[PDB]
Amino acid sequence: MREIVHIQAGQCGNQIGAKFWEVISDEHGIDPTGSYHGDSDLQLERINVYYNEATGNKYVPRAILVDLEPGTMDSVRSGPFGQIFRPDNFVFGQSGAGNNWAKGHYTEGAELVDSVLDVVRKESESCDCLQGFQLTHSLGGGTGSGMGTLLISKIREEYPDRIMNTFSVMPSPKVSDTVVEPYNATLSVHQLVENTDETYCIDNEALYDICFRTLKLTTPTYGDLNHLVSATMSGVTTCLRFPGQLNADLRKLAVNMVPFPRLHFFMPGFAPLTSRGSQQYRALTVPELTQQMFDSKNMMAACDPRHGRYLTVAAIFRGRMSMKEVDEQMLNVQNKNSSYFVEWIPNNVKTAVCDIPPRGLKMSATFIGNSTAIQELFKRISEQFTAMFRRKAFLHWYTGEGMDEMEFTEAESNMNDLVSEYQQYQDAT
Amino acid sequence: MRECISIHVGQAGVQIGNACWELYCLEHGIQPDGQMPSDKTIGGGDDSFNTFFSETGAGKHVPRAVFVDLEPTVIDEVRTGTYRQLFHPEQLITGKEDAANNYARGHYTIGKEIIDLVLDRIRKLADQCTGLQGFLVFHSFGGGTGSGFTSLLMERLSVDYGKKSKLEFSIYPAPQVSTAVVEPYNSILTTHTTLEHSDCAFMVDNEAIYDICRRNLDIERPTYTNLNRLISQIVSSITASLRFDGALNVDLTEFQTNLVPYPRIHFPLATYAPVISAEKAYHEQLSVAEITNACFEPANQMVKCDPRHGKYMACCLLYRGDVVPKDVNAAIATIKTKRSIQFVDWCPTGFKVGINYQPPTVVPGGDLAKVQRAVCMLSNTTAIAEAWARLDHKFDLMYAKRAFVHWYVGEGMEEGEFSEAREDMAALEKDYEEVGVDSVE
Amino acid sequence: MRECISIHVGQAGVQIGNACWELYCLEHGIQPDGQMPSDKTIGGGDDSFNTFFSETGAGKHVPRAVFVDLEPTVIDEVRTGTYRQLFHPEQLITGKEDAANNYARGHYTIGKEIIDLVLDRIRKLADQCTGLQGFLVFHSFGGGTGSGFTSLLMERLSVDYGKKSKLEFSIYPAPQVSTAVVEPYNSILTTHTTLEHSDCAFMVDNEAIYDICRRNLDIERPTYTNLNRLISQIVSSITASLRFDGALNVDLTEFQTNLVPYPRIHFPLATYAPVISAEKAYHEQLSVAEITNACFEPANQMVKCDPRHGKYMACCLLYRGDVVPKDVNAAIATIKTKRSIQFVDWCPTGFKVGINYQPPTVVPGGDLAKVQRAVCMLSNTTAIAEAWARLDHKFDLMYAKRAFVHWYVGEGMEEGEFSEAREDMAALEKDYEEVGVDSVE
Numbered sequence A: 001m002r003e004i005v006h007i008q009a010g011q012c013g014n015q016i017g018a019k020f021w022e023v024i025s026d027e028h029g030i031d032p033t034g035s036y037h038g039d040s041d042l043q044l045e046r047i048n049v050y051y052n053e054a055t056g057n058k059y060v061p062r063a064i065l066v067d068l069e070p071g072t073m074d075s076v077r078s079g080p081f082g083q084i085f086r087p088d089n090f091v092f093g094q095s096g097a098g099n100n101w102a103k104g105h106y107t108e109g110a111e112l113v114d115s116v117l118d119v120v121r122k123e124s125e126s127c128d129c130l131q132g133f134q135l136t137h138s139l140g141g142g143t144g145s146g147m148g149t150l151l152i153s154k155i156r157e158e159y160p161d162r163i164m165n166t167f168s169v170m171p172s173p174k175v176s177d178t179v180v181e182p183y184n185a186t187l188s189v190h191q192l193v194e195n196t197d198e199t200y201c202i203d204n205e206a207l208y209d210i211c212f213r214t215l216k217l218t219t220p221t222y223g224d225l226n227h228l229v230s231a232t233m234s235g236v237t238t239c240l241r242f243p244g245q246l247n248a249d250l251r252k253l254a255v256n257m258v259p260f261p262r263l264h265f266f267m268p269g270f271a272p273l274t275s276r277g278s279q280q281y282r283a284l285t286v287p288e289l290t291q292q293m294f295d296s297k298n299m300m301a302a303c304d305p306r307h308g309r310y311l312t313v314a315a316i317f318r319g320r321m322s323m324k325e326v327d328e329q330m331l332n333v334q335n336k337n338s339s340y341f342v343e344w345i346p347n348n349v350k351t352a353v354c355d356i357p358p359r360g361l362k363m364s365a366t367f368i369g370n371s372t373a374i375q376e377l378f379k380r381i382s383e384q385f386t387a388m389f390r391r392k393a394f395l396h397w398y399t400g401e402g403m404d405e406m407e408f409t410e411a412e413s414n415m416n417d418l419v420s421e422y423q424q425y426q427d428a429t
Numbered sequence B, C: 001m002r003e004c005i006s007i008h009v010g011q012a013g014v015q016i017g018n019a020c021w022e023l024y025c026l027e028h029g030i031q032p033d034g035q036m037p038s039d040k041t042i043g044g045g046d047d048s049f050n051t052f053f054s055e056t057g058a059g060k061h062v063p064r065a066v067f068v069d070l071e072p073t074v075i076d077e078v079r080t081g082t083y084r085q086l087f088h089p090e091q092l093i094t095g096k097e098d099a100a101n102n103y104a105r106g107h108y109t110i111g112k113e114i115i116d117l118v119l120d121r122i123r124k125l126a127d128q129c130t131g132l133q134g135f136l137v138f139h140s141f142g143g144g145t146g147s148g149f150t151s152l153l154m155e156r157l158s159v160d161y162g163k164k165s166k167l168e169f170s171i172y173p174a175p176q177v178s179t180a181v182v183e184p185y186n187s188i189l190t191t192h193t194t195l196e197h198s199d200c201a202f203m204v205d206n207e208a209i210y211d212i213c214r215r216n217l218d219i220e221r222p223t224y225t226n227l228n229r230l231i232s233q234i235v236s237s238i239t240a241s242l243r244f245d246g247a248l249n250v251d252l253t254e255f256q257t258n259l260v261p262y263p264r265i266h267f268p269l270a271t272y273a274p275v276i277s278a279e280k281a282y283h284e285q286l287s288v289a290e291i292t293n294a295c296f297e298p299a300n301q302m303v304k305c306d307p308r309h310g311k312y313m314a315c316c317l318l319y320r321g322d323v324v325p326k327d328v329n330a331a332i333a334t335i336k337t338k339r340s341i342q343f344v345d346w347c348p349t350g351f352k353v354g355i356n357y358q359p360p361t362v363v364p365g366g367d368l369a370k371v372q373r374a375v376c377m378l379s380n381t382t383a384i385a386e387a388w389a390r391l392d393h394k395f396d397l398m399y400a401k402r403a404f405v406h407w408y409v410g411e412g413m414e415e416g417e418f419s420e421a422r423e424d425m426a427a428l429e430k431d432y433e434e435v436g437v438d439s440v441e
């Protein structure tokens, strides 16, 4: 019951999920080969949320790996965790995406999506009672953006009532490593609006900032930033897999995170984050963890909450903890900072408490915020977009691939309308 | 499989390729007799020799390259030389007389006689490909075969194939140094196919390389053999992310998508930052930060040019080796900070980074030292119009008196063709005047 | 005793039988020298070797099979090979020249010379039988012996015996792949005896098997030897409930009663679901539910066909091994649920299950892995008319110019016979147009 299909898409999608199924595969004591080597029978009661048991107690995930380039697949196969996936789930083309949206959504994506939805139906027809899906992908890539939004817009036609959420990486102007990532991000924000139930917006600068300031790292790679992100994605569905005192599925969050439809862009947050060495000097508690979660410097989205108001938040704690301290800390926050909350919603916070912490510490927590300050993201992109597009730069690589202008102007307007949706719900009483 | 085709045309095009195909032999661990040695029980097309080397049966590696000359003589340095059994015999195609610094001969008279034999060599390599990437034409503007023949081929390659990338590695005429006096005649006429048929034309010239050898590198007295090892590290890095693993890999098509704004604005100059002599390789701080700044140096350019005279339009960082990205993003943010570096006002988001893990190889007997990191920066700038103004003026001088016209007309072209290729290049130089300028409201 | 007769005609018919009679040797635990080993003090015709093996005195098992060829050469691969003392010497009947891809030679000229010697081999096996079940003719449409001789035999077998089942395992001509250019001439003329004299003709073709080997199985490069191990698992399961215990056993006649609606609508294609490579055999969920769905896959067909283009008329599930029925009935009810799967409107009750306990054997050096369950689905569908439309059109092309007519007329048949066998097959294809359609009131 309550299975989750994992569709990691693109290059970025595969890197995160590579590290994602290295965490989950530790949560449940899965061997690299696929056998089970746990001790506690909590690890197995709800293993089936992610893993198909196969013949002779091997555990094959329900993940589908999609790419338009053979490379990432060959890396994953040849690595520590190649053994863990089913080889019919490594679905990939040959001709690269171009870091071009048109090329992954119309030309070379449509060719492949038939051979992938046929793998979605291998997974969906085997489940007892499916709950949801998930992309892991990148707004700013070819396959992450384009092919991802082709997969999504073809699942709503098949499975129109399952919680489909994305962990999408969004561009930041301070750190650019692709010239047309405004073009590629604009045309996919357009698709995520109408098609998705929850969207966890993650940036790059926000992850260095955690590494530098909080964790006291020296030299971060993609390897390190997605290792964080995977500890968030584990937290989301903890109460789906572990027993808790308050439970919270995918659907439970969705329901009371999202005031209006369409405003389904969340800001995660993790706590605790210490350096090694500076762990014997923080006392690890619930007021300690709450103060980090309401800190700006522990947002994995490169914004400051202080430039708006949280509509709603959720607080997912993992550990042997109290309920008074939880119910109090979550109270003392929305009193002391009552101008940082939307006031037409009483009790902006939802708490959930699991019983099972991560496999090195006690008392973690995970903050998921629906803040109005996320329009700071959508405007920084729609300024770069409108500065290139007024010249019509880089246009022939897009009109060459089946698109035209009128897909742009509408997609620019769909991004600029929801800036005026966070804006309405920040102010006006 | 990410396979690619090298075509090496004319004397300069062949003799570069010696220095290219010397290198890949070292990159993938291949002896000059085409053999991988016994210490490679690892994944071959996982080290991906398979983009430049079709593995003949019984452990034997022969390129996907074609060496074309209208003169027998140049390629006969490759037979023997040392590469006499590296190459497939049938991919070393010789004429009998060269075009002889005459575009009309390389394109109409002499070129047509071997053009179908060369296109048929392409098909024998085109049909062995699985996932063909594109072509790498090497030549020089200002030969006969490098200009006349290349123009003939690129027409035929556009018709048969269309879809694939077609990179060029030209040598542009140098403003002072020149050895042919009809050097500008052969450059105006190659303008036509370079903007139309190529997808991305690179330009280098010999003086801007003389600077780097003498100044960064303290070589007293360069020859062509010395310059071309340098040329080859630029191309070796370009095409390295096809064929090695790294985070932020970059296919051949991800250049053009990220480097090239408009249809015919596709003349990006390359640089290369760690050009350091052995002695000067200590007294290094050869971090990522310093090597990113060195790309933006107007002295470390591969073209007689000064980007302080134009605005950059895109850049494109291709790094090899011991690299942490956040060092790069902190070195970008420095680059965006400086006001000596003009981007245009419609770029905003500067540029694309790409990293690769495979460190360069030191070419034996070569000029570089052992570096840990290395960076080409392919970069569109409006400063390459200045290279053109200095060469149109040489053409416009000689064609004012109709000097060497009688050689050209009596070989299979018209007087009328000079007036069209001069207008054609004058329109390019007008495009860069209109692409440097922002629009205001 | 549930005894049965294999007849293996022509090159393809012999060479399949190698792969059949390899298998039963493993099914019943028989060495290639015909001997059961010493660890079998258990019930022989209780393991029921006695349908395919007459036990010669002194512990020796020789088939009830006859290997017939008009050419000496094919069977001489069976003498020696490894099966050189498995077979009775007198059941390997050779001619001297083959029919040579000529139906007129296999049926009139050459075939009659050995036909009475073959029918007399049948009687020597027919009189040793107690409770004879029927015959299993193996051949290929589009040989000379596979078509010409088989047509001659099936006439004679209908006259002498009448009452028994006569199964055929044909290879149908593939739409693209063919190696004989009179391949359609020999298929139109074998149409006559296939619909009239056989009781149930199966069709396979090589392309639909190439798919399965490459895709489900990750074999790079199949030969006929690889395909026929597959063929043999389909037949091995057909005839397994005669000769092993299970609940819901199915005799040879219970197919025809449950599979075949009308007199000449008896061309059911088979499938086989657990075609899985060794590596892909982990990462299995190879339950009953998954393997029932895999039968209804248009990709797992043994015929170049797509049941999405026609309607099923009956299906027929024949399972082997670790099976609980209620898992099957719950997997039927899924199949009835889906609207992709069109039964006809006069079927209502879909189909017949049959289970057997004996799991398959992994053929040594074979292509399958060790599976616990296994399913042929014999299934009438109107989509096999599409195989016919693609082959009549090849016949109608060549016969429009009367191409290879001179070979055929000068061998013992008429021009008139083409016009009758073309009408004969056009009527079949008209029967499936009229059997797919429901009646309304």
Ligand SMILES: CC(=O)O[C@H]1C(=O)[C@@]2(C)[C@H]([C@H](OC(=O)c3ccccc3)[C@]3(O)C[C@H](OC(=O)[C@H](O)[C@@H](NC(=O)c4ccccc4)c4ccccc4)C(C)=C1C3(C)C)[C@]1(OC(C)=O)CO[C@@H]1C[C@@H]2O
Residues within 6 Å of the ligand: A022, A023, A024, A026, A215, A224, A225, A226, A227, A228, A229, A230, A231, A232, A234, A235, A272, A273, A274, A275, A276, A279, A357, A358, A359, A360, A361
């Ligand atoms: C001696 C000791 O107690 O070691 C700790 C440790 O020093 C600390 C610093 C860890 C450590 O984390 C990091 O340094 C880090 C690296 C990349 C990305 C994110 C973090 C640790 O590496 C991580 C590791 O985490 C786990 O085991 C969790 O179960 C976690 N797992 C993974 O991310 C993972 C790591 C390696 C291999 C496989 C999985 C998790 C979190 C959320 C959801 C699922 C799993 C722990 C407690 C530690 C080390 C080992 C040093 C911290 O992180 C986490 C997520 O627990 C960083 O701040 C916390 C506080 C911990 O005390």
Ligand SMILES: Nc1nc2c(ncn2[C@@H]2O[C@H](COP(=O)(O)OP(=O)(O)O)[C@@H](O)[C@H]2O)c(=O)[nH]1
Residues within 6 Å of the ligand: A010, A011, A012, A013, A015, A016, A067, A068, A069, A096, A097, A098, A099, A138, A139, A140, A141, A142, A143, A144, A169, A178, A181, A222, A223, A226, B248
């Ligand atoms: N978080 C994250 N983003 C990535 C990673 N790799 C690429 N990206 C992002 O993905 C986009 C580029 O798409 P890419 O994955 O290269 O497309 P591909 O051709 O399918 O590999 C950019 O916006 C990057 O920031 C990764 O490892 N982690």
